[PDB]
Amino acid sequence: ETLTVHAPSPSTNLPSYGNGAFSLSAPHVPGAGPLLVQVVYSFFQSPNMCLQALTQLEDYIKKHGASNPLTLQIISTNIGYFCNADRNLVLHPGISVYDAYHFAKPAPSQYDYRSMNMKQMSGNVTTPIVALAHYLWGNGAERSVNIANIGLKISPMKINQIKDIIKSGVVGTFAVSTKFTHATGDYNVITGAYLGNITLKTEGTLTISANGSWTYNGVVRSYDDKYDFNASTHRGIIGESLTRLGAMFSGKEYQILLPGEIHIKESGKR
8 A cells, every 4th residue: 555645735844955954965075174166056957955854854764764754744845846946947947956946035935836837847856756746746647848848868870760771881971760778767766767768769860080080960859758666667776766755655657848940969989
């Protein structure tokens, strides 16, 4: 059986992340002196802030029991800070995570999932936690993230069709039009956590010199219309964390749309 976490609402939220006993911050580095805001500000832009918050939730559940009322309230509350941050990210593309997280109005402690949850996730470092939020409270509603927001890094030499042109030894310009699987959790621990392995379509131009130098210019879109958020599609260490949490707490699986397209330009050698 699994335990129900109540949705963040102003009437049930703790006054503070972590009930004010712990917070989301950069790691203490012995010998470095005072923790300064420039270090915190970079920590918050990086994937470690997401993993840190998941790790604090796990520690907490472990130390105090998954079914301890205050544990349930921490999970609800801390997850709430992340949804709130992520809304400010979606609403104000361009701002830093540190700013979206700490200086949003309304206060994070006032986050109301029922009235404020969004269908669109930012795709920034807060997203894996927001996507767990939707598992817990979204009742199966479909969500989305734009393909421009997921930090895709494509290697054209690992796509069979382009790899083959490059290996064949031909010279000049060649059309490419193919599908491929792309394991985002091999290099992006954020995207991987909630999208994992995706399928993509590319079309474009592969230019190769006689010297073995090549550029692929192309457009990339999702091949599947949507992806499942469940225990089995998570990838990477943040995803392992999401799975341990979803196995403990009630929720509903759901799907994620991956609309839009990106333009890539990548280069290499034979």
